[PDB]
Amino acid sequence: NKRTTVNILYVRKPDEFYVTLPHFQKAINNLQKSVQKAAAAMYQNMLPRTDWQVGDMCYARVQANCDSQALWYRGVVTGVIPPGITCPIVRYQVHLRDLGELIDDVHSSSLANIDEADMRISSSAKRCHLHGIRPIGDEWSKDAIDFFMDQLKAYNEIHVTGRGRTENSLSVILWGSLSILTGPFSPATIKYVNINKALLMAGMAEKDHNSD
């Protein structure tokens, strides 16, 4: 009721990270290996294409955060990187809809056309930001991001409480749960820790006065 358990797919910053409902996890996996087949056929069958622009949907063959090998992903072209002295080819930045991670320096050769079903299938990665807090400065510092990451791996499970949504993200109070084993006759006890407040108390963020 008050808390919904989630799986953390990818973390960029405390104001941008991506989750999924735990029961949905298998369907996400099925979608990913389904995506490999569709993308691979597309790549060799399609005519070569070089006209890629921002806002274009696509498949990208890229190595994501926890990938040992490059794999196909559903993506949206977020940026165009003009040729440079080190690299004389146009390249692109791609947002991976099922993971949430931005990938830079993607060659046109790694991009493939996307058909119309895999365009309207809802993105697996659900965007969130920590509610009621902001960085102490222009941007989230590396310390604060590292602190956030450290908190996430410091708990048994992760839970969110919704505080409304912005135009592309859901505002949440992130909860860490500890499980306490108290004898064979009694069930484990669960305690919840407020990660948002943990960032505040550690001096890694300050209260956002735009929130109520």
Added chain:
Amino acid sequence: KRTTVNILYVRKPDEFYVTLPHFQKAINNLQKSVQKAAAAMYQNMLPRTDWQVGDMCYARVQANCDSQALWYRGVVTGVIPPGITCPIVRYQVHLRDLGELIDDVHSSSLANIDEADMRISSSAKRCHLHGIRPIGDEWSKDAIDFFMDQLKAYNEIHVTGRGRTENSLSVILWGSLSILTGPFSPATIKYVNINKALLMAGMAEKDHN
């Protein structure tokens, strides 16, 4: 004195990598020589997870201008503990022949390197722009983008050495323009001081040391 160079890779105005232009073919031979040696080691070698900072190695990674992952001579610069998103140890590797840092490299992509292949001097020579420093704590994206723009805005790039730290060479970077002035006269070259251009644009400040 000015020596023409090829820019291999740029991280920041205080960290970029060059080579002498005549060495370029020799670098190319080394890279595809590396492919042979590394692939051998990989299928040869016993599996290893013992990777530590300062360890010499081969890394199969997708570098900056690579469409596909390739083998590179490397040194492990960092160890990345497992996280909630990725439950495996990973490593950060510096590519000696390119100069670029690569993050999140799995142990499966790492291979042992033998010592003959290891002691060949790095193709990439480290440089930093002399007499300047960032305005803020660190180089801003604006300054880095400006620096990149300067490098591609000229016909050729040249360096003048003004001393060395222990791992990097302090230089004045020069951009050259060629001016065509009729069939009878040879073209004239004008040089622009890239270090100064950054100072002028307010993208950097004087070192005063």
